[PDB]
């Protein structure tokens, strides 16, 4: 989700962009500013929420030993989804 | 035989240190305070000598932190305050000494949690 700035400079996913008065912009003349186009926040927001039939679920990021340390997530709050602290995947219990 | 010098120990002319980093520096001799996030006391046993903080500025190219003083990372360990004072004096550095802070002994009583008439009785466990 790359947007442009008033000077035309591309904005990074961390939100960095030189101001108009900033002289450091001169380093991009006759060259380019390296920006990664795959914003992880939007990509993780695109993932669907899993529904499970237990109060506690377990997440390891997928791939077993190729994922992250395995953690357990509580799903007692009905008006909220449980989020993995490593992966960002979301889990919930069936409602309504 | 011996010559019996009657002067004060002074080795500044032999250490190679520039004059500016001798006369304009203030060293601090202290026992470091316990980190309040932990209960361990093993880091509050020795005396430390450290130098006064100088300027740091952002690097233009990568925004890193840049310094111009060479003593910004120098920390010395000593067994006693007198040893640190002697080292600082013989190296020509002017110093500030802070006395050691030791927690005072406390009177603990588990029974006081259930006092018949005092305010120390706990409402929960």
């Amino acid at each position: 989700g790359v947007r442009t700035s008033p000077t035309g400079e591309k904005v990074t996913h961390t939100g960095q962009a030189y101001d108009d008065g900033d002289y450091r912009r001169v380093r991009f003349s006759d060259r380019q500013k390296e920006v990664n186009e795959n914003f992880a926040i939007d990509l993780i927001a695109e993932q669907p929420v899993s529904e499970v039939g237990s109060r506690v679920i377990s997440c390891d990021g997928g791939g077993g030993a190729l994922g992250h340390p395995r953690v357990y997530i509580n799903l007692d709050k009905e008006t909220k989804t449980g989020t993995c602290g490593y992966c960002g995947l979301q889990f919930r219990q069936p409602h309504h | 035989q011996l010559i019996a010098v009657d002067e004060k120990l002074d080795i500044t002319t032999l250490t190679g240190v520039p004059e500016e980093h001798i006369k304009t520096r203030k060293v601090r001799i202290f026992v470091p305070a316990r980190n309040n996030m932990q209960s361990g006391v093993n880091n509050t046993k020795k005396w430390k000598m450290e130098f006064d903080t100088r300027e740091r500025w952002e690097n233009p190219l990568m925004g890193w932190s840049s310094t111009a003083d060479p003593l910004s990372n120098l920390v010395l360990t000593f067994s006693t305050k007198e040893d640190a004072v002697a080292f600082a004096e013989k190296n020509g550095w002017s110093f500030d000494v802070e006395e050691r802070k030791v927690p005072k002994p406390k009177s603990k009583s588990y029974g006081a949690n259930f006092s018949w008439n005092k305010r120390t009785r706990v409402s929960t466990k």
């Binding site: - | 305070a33 006064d52 903080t53 740091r56 952002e58 890193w64 006395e99 005072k104 305010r119």
Partner: protein
């Protein structure tokens, strides 16, 4: 409170408590812990002057210093004045005092008001917490007058609660019924009660008479009304009756004054005039604002075309009204002396350097003095502290709290002025928690304190 400042790569990261058994001993208040955020915004980084259109414009140190020096050489005496704010250090205070003394000016004032009749600032014990913070653990009765110790001095209130819990301490309050997190006896809120305890016509006078280790604490915030002198005289009369009926218990120092401003005690030690009344009576033509952001004096109280100079670290009440802005250093950016409400002198250490073109405050004053022709003798920090020792030698003893007691002389000098009390209840400035988070320039710029205010005013 003793603290540890955590910094990384030239940036202040967090504030942690540092153990001092006599002062805070493991804790800090929430403002002390979370107000570091404020220092990162609304900061003064460059000198500023007024352009052709009356707008503030960046300029070099030389230009601003030259303008201030010319304006200072123009005038003399009562036409020059200064106001010291709540976060000023002793070194800058003594430097500014010497600079204005070279002009033969004595209008060196603080925003916080202390009564000047009788002994005034001549005797230190007149304006100190003589029992000390540790001494609260030895008292059996403490009388609180016109104060809210919970928010004015949270760690002092914590010590009071410790004594209440472990020593069965008896606490009585005169003022509005605030919540102090411990049970106390509420005598009332009218100041007449003070006289009733001074005349012996109150049961609590009897209670104080049988108290072998009594304490009476009067808040500085209660001395801000017009009848502060009479209130201080009444409290002194109560302490007199305690000392006379109960005799002398050795060295107990019943009389006590609780301060809320970090710079007040050092300024009183150096001879600053408490209050801003001298400025009102003789409106100056050149005014120095040394971190003064209490809005005590605006441009309505001053004549037109008055030259106002602000020296500080934050853009707040004081900066937009100034003709020249001199960016100074914050307390995390200098080694500076601060004196306790106990009277204990302590020093800060440099954690990070001042941002932009900001400089050490005493260095700014010394450079200005050299530009203006009246060069101050001291050139380094050690020489400024030697000057401090010259003016008040207790400012260089960096953990000492013991001092002489002159209660008899101050009490005798306090009973020759018989001004009357006011029929207004004693109301502390901070009545609830929401008035706690934002009190000074740094905490007003903090986003965390704003979040705390929003959270306490509405739960959600």
């Amino acid at each position: 409170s003793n603290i540890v400042v955590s910094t990384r790569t030239g940036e202040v990261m967090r504030i942690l408590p540092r153990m001092h058994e006599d002062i805070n001993e493991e804790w800090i208040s929430d403002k002390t812990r979370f107000a570091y955020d404020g220092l990162k915004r609304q900061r003064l980084t460059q000198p500023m002057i007024r352009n052709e259109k009356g707008l503030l414009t960046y300029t070099t140190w030389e230009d601003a210093l030259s303008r201030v020096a010319g304006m200072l050489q123009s005038f003399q005496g009562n036409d020059v004045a200064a106001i010291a704010g709540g976060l000023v250090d002793a070194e800058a205070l003594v430097a500014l005092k010497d600079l204005l003394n070279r002009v033969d000016s004595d209008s060196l004032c603080t925003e916080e008001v202390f009564p000047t009749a009788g002994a005034g600032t001549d005797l230190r014990s007149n304006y100190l917490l003589n029992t000390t913070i540790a001494g609260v653990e030895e008292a059996d009765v403490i009388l609180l007058v016109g104060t809210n110790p919970r928010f004015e001095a949270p760690l002092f209130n914590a010590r009071i609660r410790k004594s209440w819990l472990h020593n069965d301490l008896k606490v009585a309050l005169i003022g509005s019924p605030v919540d102090l997190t411990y049970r106390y006896d509420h005598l009332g809120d009218s100041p007449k009660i003070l006289q009733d305890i001074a005349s012996g016509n109150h049961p609590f006078s009897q209670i104080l008479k049988e108290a072998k280790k009594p304490m009476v604490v009067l808040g500085s915030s209660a001395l801000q009304r017009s009848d502060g002198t009479a209130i201080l005289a009444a409290v002194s009369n109560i302490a007199q009756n305690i000392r006379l009926s109960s005799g002398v218990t050795g060295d107990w120092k019943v009389m006590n004054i609780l301060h809320r401003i970090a710079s007040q005690v050092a300024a009183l030690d150096l001879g600053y005039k408490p209050g801003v009344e001298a400025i009102r009576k003789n409106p100056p033509k050149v005014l120095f604002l040394l971190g003064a952001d209490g809005g005590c004096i605006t441009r309505q109280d001053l004549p037109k075309d008055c030259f106002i100079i602000y020296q500080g670290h934050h853009g707040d009440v004081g900066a937009p009204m100034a003709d020249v802005i001199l960016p100074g250093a914050a307390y995390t950016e200098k080694s500076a002396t601060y004196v306790n409400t106990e009277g204990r002198a302590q020093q800060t250490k440099v954690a990070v350097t001042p941002p932009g073109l900001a400089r050490e405050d005493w260095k700014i004053i010394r450079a200005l003095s050299e530009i203006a022709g009246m060069t101050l003798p001291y050139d380094t920090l050690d020489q400024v502290r030697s000057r401090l020792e010259e003016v008040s030698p207790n400012l260089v003893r960096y953990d000492d709290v013991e001092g002489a007691n002159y209660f008899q002389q101050a009490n005798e000098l306090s009973k020759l002025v018989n001004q009357q009390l006011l029929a207004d209840p004693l109301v502390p400035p901070q009545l609830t928690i929401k008035d706690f988070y934002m009190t000074d320039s740094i905490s007003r710029a903090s986003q965390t304190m704003a979040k705390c205010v929003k959270a306490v005013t509405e739960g959600i």
